[PDB]
Each structure stands twice: as structure tokens, then as C-alpha cells.
Amino acid sequence: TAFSCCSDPDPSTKDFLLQQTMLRIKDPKKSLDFYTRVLGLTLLQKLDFPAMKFSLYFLAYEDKNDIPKDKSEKTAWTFSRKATLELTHNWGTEDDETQSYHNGNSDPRGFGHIGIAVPDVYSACKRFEELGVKFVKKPDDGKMKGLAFIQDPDGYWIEILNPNKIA
Amino acid sequence: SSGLTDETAFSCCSDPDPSTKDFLLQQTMLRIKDPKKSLDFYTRVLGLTLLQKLDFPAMKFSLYFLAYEDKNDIPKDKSEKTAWTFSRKATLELTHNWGTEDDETQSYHNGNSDPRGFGHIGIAVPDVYSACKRFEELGVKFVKKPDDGMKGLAFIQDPDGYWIEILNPNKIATI
Ligand SMILES: O=c1cc(-c2ccccc2)oc2cc(O)c(O)c(O)c12
Ligand SMILES: O=c1cc(-c2ccccc2)oc2cc(O)c(O)c(O)c12
Ligand SMILES: [Zn+2]
Ligand SMILES: [Zn+2]
Numbered sequence: 001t002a003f004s005c006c007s008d009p010d011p012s013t014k015d016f017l018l019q020q021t022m023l024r025i026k027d028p029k030k031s032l033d034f035y036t037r038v039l040g041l042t043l044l045q046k047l048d049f050p051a052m053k054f055s056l057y058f059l060a061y062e063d064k065n066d067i068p069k070d071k072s073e074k075t076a077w078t079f080s081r082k083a084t085l086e087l088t089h090n091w092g093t094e095d096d097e098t099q100s101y102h103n104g105n106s107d108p109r110g111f112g113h114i115g116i117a118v119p120d121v122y123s124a125c126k127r128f129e130e131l132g133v134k135f136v137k138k139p140d141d142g143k144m145k146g147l148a149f150i151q152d153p154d155g156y157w158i159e160i161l162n163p164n165k166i167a
Numbered sequence: 168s169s170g171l172t173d174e175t176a177f178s179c180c181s182d183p184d185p186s187t188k189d190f191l192l193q194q195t196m197l198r199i200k201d202p203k204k205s206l207d208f209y210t211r212v213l214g215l216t217l218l219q220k221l222d223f224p225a226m227k228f229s230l231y232f233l234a235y236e237d238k239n240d241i242p243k244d245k246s247e248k249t250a251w252t253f254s255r256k257a258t259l260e261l262t263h264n265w266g267t268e269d270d271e272t273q274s275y276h277n278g279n280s281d282p283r284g285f286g287h288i289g290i291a292v293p294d295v296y297s298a299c300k301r302f303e304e305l306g307v308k309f310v311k312k313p314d315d316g317m318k319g320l321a322f323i324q325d326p327d328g329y330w331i332e333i334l335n336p337n338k339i340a341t342i
Binding site for chain 1: 173176180181182184191194204213235238246251253256262275277283287292301329332
């Protein structure tokens with residue numbers, strides 16, 4: 001409401017940037033295929049933590065030729081990119097048929113979705129269909145047309161939107 | 168369990184289809200109990216700018232779009248404003264279902280306890296210790312202080328208990 005929005009944030013925050021959104025993923029083989037092949041993201045970096053039994057995969061809309069190859073240069077670059085998706089893999093969940101993650105849209109709710117802006121929701125979704133992508137909401141379904149939701153291999157919801165046709 | 172080799176992981180990566188060339192990662196949506204508390208936290212404490220507020224009286228919810236953007240860049244015309252808001256990179260979408268603020272029975276799940284899923288958003292800052300010193304002075308609740316545990320990396324909580332990572336890209340290459 002009216003007073004809650006600070007319009008003159010302290011200058012010590014002026015260089016803060018929204019660097020990542022982290023989601024836990026059961027199987028990086030499926031997740032990496034989906035985010036790179038279907039949605040066109042690039043894998044920036046894979047970090048492994050043997051002592052803690054997990055790996056991190058950082059994906060973003062970045063040109064792979066921009067990514068430094070030396071692992072130390074790569075690390076500083078990856079963490080200074082805007083809008084990365086951090087996928088956390090706890091070792092062994094792929095081979096654990098008892099295990100799966102919660103997408104936040106049913107009890108208990110919290111997290112809702114990530115969202116990707118695209119030039120053409122209908123063409124993009126037509127391609128998603130041809131690729132066998134699972135839909136939550138097709139662009140025509142529901143009546144808030146021209147907006148879609150698809151699901152990644154863990155069942156997380158991804159909004160597919162056009163900024164001009166939201167209006 | 169041993170985790171993927173680099174070779175396995177990279178072999179599951181395809182190059183992007185040219186039809187996705189202009190796709191951008193636009194938003195992360197979180198549900199929020201109290202918009203007064205949340206907007207104060209994200210604008211005043213973390214310095215994001217509220218790009219736009221949308222109200223849907225028929226359905227009894229509101230949306231808040233926040234981002235690290237120059238407030239002077241926001242268009243005045245509401246058609247211009249919506250297309251600009253929705254084409255900004257890395258925005259935070261906060262969804263408020265009306266009335267949750269004054270229901271002491273209600274709260275949202277931050278994803279970090281059973282059943283797990285979502286973990287956090289993360290903000291890169293010039294100096295984690297300086298940022299956290301201010302957070303401490305502003306009464307921010309911490310999950311992990313930078314000195315405690317992986318020094319130089321922190322986690323704080325927003326008013327719903329969502330975890331927010333505080334990191335310095337120039338020092339994270341040190342564990
Ligand atoms: O409920 C929503 C309604 C509208 C909307 C915006 C402009 C004109 C008409 C409808 O946009 C949205 C965008 C989102 O990213 C989202 O998660 C949403 O739930 C909505
Ligand atoms: O466990 C983590 C370890 C490291 C790390 C990075 C460089 C050198 C040493 C350790 O970075 C992280 C970054 C994140 O965004 C995150 O959610 C994490 O859990 C970690
Ligand atoms: Zn993280
Ligand atoms: Zn959304």
C-alpha cells in the first residue's frame with residue numbers, strides 16, 4: 001500500500017543485483033536437457049561439493065562464447081550475471097524412486113513460478129507442443145489468453161509471457 | 168551416490184534453438200502474506216524498485232513487480248508501463264491473496280523444509296559484510312550470518328521467511 005514503498009533506497013544498495021533463483025532438481029540429465037534444448041538457456045557452470053554431496057548448475061540466457069573457460073575466471077563471471085537459474089542437485093535423487101520435489105502451487109504453497117518473456121507466445125508454445133513439453137495452462141485455455149504455463153521435469157511451473165500482449 | 172561427471176552433465180546440454188534467441192528470464196514469483204511488510208523489506212532494506220502494482224478486485228489478489236531499475240526509467244502511461252515492466256530482466260513478482268495479512272492461522276512455505284523445492288533468491292552485492300552490517304542495524308532476520316559456518320556468504324529471511332542469499336561475486340571464489 002501507499003507508504004510501504006521506499007522510493008529513495010539507501011545508496012549502499014545501488015549496485016545490488018538479482019543474481020539467482022534456486023530450485024532443487026531430482027535429475028540434472030532431464031533438467032539440463034529441458035532448460036538448454038527446450039528453453040534455450042546456456043549452462044554457465046557446474047560446481048561440485050563432494051563433502052556435502054551436492055552439485056550446483058547455473059543456467060542463464062547467455063552466449064556460451066562469453067563464458068570464461070578458466071574455472072576461477074568462470075566462477076567470478078557466473079556469479080556476476082543477472083537473472084541466473086541455480087539448480088541444486090542432491091546426489092542420488094535421480095536413483096531414488098521414493099523422492100520428488102514440491103513446486104509450491106499446492107498445499108503447502110509458497111513459491112509460484114519462474115517466467116520467461118518471449119516474442120511470440122503462440123509460436124513458442126506450438127514448438128513446446130511439438131517437443132512434448134507438459135502444459136499447466138495453454139495460451140488459449142483459461143481466460144487470460146496469450147499467456148501460458150509449462151512444467152519442467154521436476155514439475156516447477158514456468159510462465160510463458162509476452163510483455164506487450166499482457167495489457 | 169556420486170553425482171554427475173562433467174562429461175555426463177555437459178553431454179545433456181544442447182545449443183539453443185534460434186527461435187529462443189530473444190527469450191529472457193523475466194520473473195520469479197513468490198506468494199506473500201502481508202504486502203506492507205514485504206514491500207518495505209524489498210524496497211527499503213534491499214533497495215529494489217517497485218515497477219508496477221496490479222489489483223484484481225474480482226479475484227481478490229494483487230501483484231507487485233520489483234526490480235533493480237532506475238525509477239526514472241518507469242513509463243507514466245499504463246500501457247507503456249506494463250510492457251516495460253514485463254520486459255525487464257530479473258524481476259521479483261510478489262503475489263498477495265487479500266486477507267492473508269490478518270489471519271494468524273495462515274503462512275507460506277519457504278521450500279526449505281519438507282516438502283522441499285524452491286530454495287532461495289540471491290542478490291549479488293559489492294561487500295557482503297557491509298551489506299549485512301546494515302541488515303543487522305535495520306533489524307533484518309538472518310538465516311546464516313557471513314562470519315558463521317563458508318565465510319563471506321550470507322542468508323537472510325524476508326517477512327514471509329523466504330531465504331535470500333547475499334553473495335559477492337568477487338570473493339565467492341574463496342569458498
Ligand atoms: O494474474 C495475473 C494477471 C496479469 C495481467 C496483467 C495485465 C493485464 C491483465 C492481466 O498478469 C499476470 C502476470 C504474471 O506474471 C502472473 O504470475 C499473474 O498471475 C498475472
Ligand atoms: O554451497 C554453495 C557453495 C558455493 C561456493 C562457490 C564458490 C566457491 C566455493 C563455494 O557457492 C554457492 C552459491 C550459491 O548460490 C548457493 O546457493 C550455494 O549453496 C553455494
Ligand atoms: Zn544460491
Ligand atoms: Zn508471474
